[PDB]
Amino acid sequence: ITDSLAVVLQRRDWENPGVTQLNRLAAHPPFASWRNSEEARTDRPSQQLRSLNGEWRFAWFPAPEAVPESWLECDLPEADTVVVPSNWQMHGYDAPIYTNVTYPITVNPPFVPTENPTGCYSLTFNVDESWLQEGQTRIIFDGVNSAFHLWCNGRWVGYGQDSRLPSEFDLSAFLRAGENRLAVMVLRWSDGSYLEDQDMWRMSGIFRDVSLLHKPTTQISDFHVATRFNDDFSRAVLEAEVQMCGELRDYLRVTVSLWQGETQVASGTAPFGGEIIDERGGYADRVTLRLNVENPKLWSAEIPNLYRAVVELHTADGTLIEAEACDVGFREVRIENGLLLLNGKPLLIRGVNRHEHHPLHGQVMDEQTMVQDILLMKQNNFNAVRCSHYPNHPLWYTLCDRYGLYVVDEANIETHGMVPMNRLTDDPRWLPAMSERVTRMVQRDRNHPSVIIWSLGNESGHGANHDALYRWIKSVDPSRPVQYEGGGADTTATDIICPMYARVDEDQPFPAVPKWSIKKWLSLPGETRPLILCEYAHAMGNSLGGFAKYWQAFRQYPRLQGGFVWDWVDQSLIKYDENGNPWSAYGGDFGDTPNDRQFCMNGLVFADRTPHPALTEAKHQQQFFQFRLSGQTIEVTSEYLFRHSDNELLHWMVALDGKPLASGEVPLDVAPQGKQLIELPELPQPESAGQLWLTVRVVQPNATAWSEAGHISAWQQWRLAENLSVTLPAASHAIPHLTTSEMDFCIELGNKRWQFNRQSGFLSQMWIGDKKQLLTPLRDQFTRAPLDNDIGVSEATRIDPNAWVERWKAAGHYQAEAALLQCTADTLADAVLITTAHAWQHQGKTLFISRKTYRIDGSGQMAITVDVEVASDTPHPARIGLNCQLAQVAERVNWLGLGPQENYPDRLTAACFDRWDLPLSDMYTPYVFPSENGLRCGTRELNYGPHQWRGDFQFNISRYSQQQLMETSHRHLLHAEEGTWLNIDGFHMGIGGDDSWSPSVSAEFQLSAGRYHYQLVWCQK
Amino acid sequence: DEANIETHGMVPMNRLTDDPRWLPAMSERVTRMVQRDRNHPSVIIWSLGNESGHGANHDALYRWIKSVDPSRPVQYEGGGADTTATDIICPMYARVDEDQPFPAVPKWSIKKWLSLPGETRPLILCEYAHAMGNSLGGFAKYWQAFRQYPRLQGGFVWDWVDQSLIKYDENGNPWSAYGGDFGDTPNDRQFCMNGLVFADRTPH
Amino acid sequence: ITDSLAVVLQRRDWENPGVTQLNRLAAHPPFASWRNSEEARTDRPSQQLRSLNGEWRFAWFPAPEAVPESWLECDLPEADTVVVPSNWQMHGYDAPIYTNVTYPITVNPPFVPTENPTGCYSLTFNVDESWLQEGQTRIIFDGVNSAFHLWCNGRWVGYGQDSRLPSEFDLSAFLRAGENRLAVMVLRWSDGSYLEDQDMWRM
């Protein structure tokens, strides 16, 4: 009766910040309750641990109040069978929502909306009775979003809040032998929601594991590990504190053993009872052991050396009651003199922020995925990750511990949508709620070596609640520093200056919470902390421009110790078309309102875990080896702090315009932070004209746990020389033949023919034989299909006048009208010469002026010359080039320039100058939300079909016009056009990326010169 | 002004104070006081309570106040009288010249305490000169020290009035009662009597 | 029904450190709500402020569970008339205890003892309706030791812990014009007790 919904729901615990849990047990590190040492030791699987994951019964309701009492007793008829864990929105029950800042619900804390989607989960299962006899049996919910009530065998059990941490309950008193039934009522909204405003998809359900744990009545209730070292790390002290629950008896003992794989390194045994702590005594129920270790093996992202620790609770006679264990890593994290140190050295964080997201599973995680991520990261030179913005699936930590990644554990608190942001955080009333959120995380994760920094959450302003919490940790766990960006990134609540989106050299002086250039920030009067950006280089779409600027600063300023890119994967979901075709969806794609469109897409990889081109730039900028070239010597520098170049091969090679003339292989031998000199054999001195370039690569001969054999970890290239061509084109036996008409001019030469329309002034068509070559005339082009960055947050409804796109639009760039100023033809002794002049205008203003010359000789080549003038008072144009639609369509693309991936002016350091050949398809970048893409710069020769272009330009080539791209919102809606679209740019604006909601392209990358010149050569084979 | 928190009987004393679980409870206790009394000029120091050992909960609370009300210092004696949780060294019952070196929470002579390596805070005894019955011997010793050492800024005597209650004899005669006088068990007898004045407010 | 003891006491909020209050308003400095400057200025007395101190009706029980639902509705027969504020031990209801360090009860947080002396206080009073028309009306307990539940006109209102600070509740929705009745159930032990071990008389 009191177990009745009617009654339980009476209280509406989900609308009371004062109630965050009911009868939930206390937090702690991971238990298995092994009943055998070896097992625990070898991390086998414990039988006192049982998963309840699988098929369950589900039913959905628009509101809690609509639930039926029967439910408690009996399963429903209309119930469905579902797999757990999972997100109900992923099963079509309701929609997933995608907002960033704005709360999905109405802001009226601590009130949630009357219509609050309820998910009734139920499960019937059997229990061994042996369990029922002795010991304790509890259930564990690794993750339930957002809040929920629980019943067992018809009996009300408890309540819980905080979608990201475990919830435990003692079932011991509700279990019957044999068949039992669980009834979990889960709710979308709760007061907890107010603390969970992360910019992610808003979902719900039992998205994390469910289990049962059988523990002895007298058991290990908790334990902590700590390492201490001597000044040189030649000796450590493992110190373990253990707490027990149960019946205290003098024959109880505890043994802690340290293992190095097969070897037992140290052991210690003792009886309960601590040292005096105060006037009343000590902890009778605790005990602390101290193990000494000589020449311990240190743990690091570079070399995750691990040890295993075993905690055995037993009697004096030797009888074991139970065992617990964990992996241990010897490392010391400390901030000293402005620097963040690890094991004595100063780190350089090559980090990234990462959400728990699966295109198919929603927020549900699994080993497989996790590992994928890890491997990728490692493979791309990352060494750290930030749990944006809640505690992760437990397994994660282990993996990181094992694989080697620095981690920032972050509390599940974001109140982004409040106003002002710290409205809650500065309120005592919410303190307790917040507290729970921090404390619990700590208790759970504190023994993992990979965790090196605690974080109080994200975007929640700065409030006293923070200060208090910050302090709490400090007292409880002094082994790791604490950071928090809210309220200015340098408050009393952070041990590190951890801004987000601060620029390298430019200040953004917002009131109250200005973002200084990072170099300046460091030097403010009185400032002494290290600086690490919690978020930077917004990777939304075609982005990452400027990345190198950061890396360079990082490398030059000691106190700038890196940052975490934003972010790992796109938060895109799959949908299907009627043909059962899957496609990537984003904000509003589920009729979800309100929503933030593509904003959920900012990763370096696609949800499927396929890389965006940007990834490469990252990998390159983050390499662990740095090169210097001096004469014939290569200087190599190691950015490793702990390892030696023991799996490194250096391949080098020389080529002339793509023609390889020499290669070499040299094994690396460099100590962490050391230098290696590399002597080059005498280099070739070709006569032929061209550019001589040197290229080095670093290879990993042997595979690793995270990499294959032959992995490339670093590269670098240099231009050795140049041999200017002083040659002359041999004579032609003939010369083109001009032919006027009213409409045009005709140039003929053999099978070749070119035509220029006299009204438009453009080269309208050209033939080879009887084959027309263009579907569209060759013309000047000044715009681009806006990048995400070009758009920012401008919306049709709510336009952002400073967005590039906005300006371009307003300027009429997108719709200016060309006007022939002049067009003439002339016959020279050795060729035909055409000259034109056009003007683009808009509303009486002249934006650009394009003056060209086309000169066709007897060799059949057409040389083009372009000179443009840009009004100083118009917004710098996205680009300056030409375009046309070629009638032909080929398989491959071959060029001599920067490659092979997409590269832009402010994003091309990772690219190499060579000869590339790819399939047309590869020249396209399937950004979910479409825009200008696939460009390659620094090109000297381009070949497609019978065509060849020469000069010095950048280009792109695909089947989609810029207009198409510009007019389509999803990749899945593009359809190839008739021939091949080609854009050849003399110049192209940068892409930016410092952030995606303001103009982020640096001046050096803007087309602000006023006058531009370029030349080109076109021919056929 | 002192928060309503004493866990004296725990064991060890900070059993609760060092537990997150009790944090919220404790919090309420502090926060609320502050919100209520902060505008009174007479209040010049906030105190986190009494005899509850020293626990993280304390640190957090200490900090909270500091942030919210920077106008007054915060003190707390628990756990040694000189923890990170107090702006002042505020022991109770430390002697003028003699040290009482209890393990973990020794009570140094107050003159010595001041000079410990690294110590810089002022010292004010939160409790001293136990006025139980025929007492107060030695009082002058303190006063003199106080007067001679700048950093010794005084203290609060323990305590004002006797905590005695009235009872009646059969002749309807009233009489002062103490521990166990109500059959109350267990009890601490006269210990409730340590004032400078009698409950009626008549001076000792 | 949900206002029923049977139901309310179900939860045993007094044995849960997680629950320290229910529907209690937020803390703040002292208000009078003067409606005239001068008054406030000269610290006169505000009429938006009313004392409920005086004679009330009291009844004592060895345990909460022993209370009678009737109580909610109707005053008791065996109820006594008492002055408030006051300490029930001072009226002979039970004994005052004098321990210093040692807890008066058994140490088993957050558990309190089954026999936990309950004091049922009740009060019937009249409310001007003008108050009932506009504005907000709340009640204020300057001090209740140690924990307690509250009802107004038969309706369950809230809960509170911490014997030394005020507890406030908005009555606005439970008041009727004219006659109203308050029912306050007060408890000796509560989880709060674990935080109130001062060496003083336990009342």
Ligand SMILES: OC[C@H]1O[C@@H](O[C@H]2[C@H](O)[C@@H](O)[C@H](O)O[C@@H]2CO)[C@H](F)[C@@H](O)[C@H]1O
């Ligand atoms: O990828 C989204 C990021 O948004 C930033 O917040 C911006 C927000 O995008 C913008 O709409 C608003 O005008 O300004 C905010 C600046 O605080 C976040 F800060 C990032 O962490 C991402 O969520």
Ligand SMILES: OC[C@H]1O[C@@H](O[C@H]2[C@H](O)[C@@H](O)[C@H](O)O[C@@H]2CO)[C@H](F)[C@@H](O)[C@H]1O
């Ligand atoms: O007036 C009583 C005072 O007792 C002190 O505590 C003593 C206690 O009296 C004694 O029985 C025990 O052995 O040692 C305690 C020392 O911590 C208090 F500290 C004072 O504040 C008074 O309560």
Ligand SMILES: [Mg+2]
């Ligand atoms: Mg709640």
Ligand SMILES: [Mg+2]
């Ligand atoms: Mg956000």
Ligand SMILES: [Mg+2]
């Ligand atoms: Mg309680």
Ligand SMILES: [Mg+2]
């Ligand atoms: Mg005491």
Ligand code: NA
């Ligand atoms: Na640096």
Ligand code: NA
């Ligand atoms: Na985003």
Ligand code: NA
């Ligand atoms: Na002095």
Ligand code: NA
């Ligand atoms: Na006393």
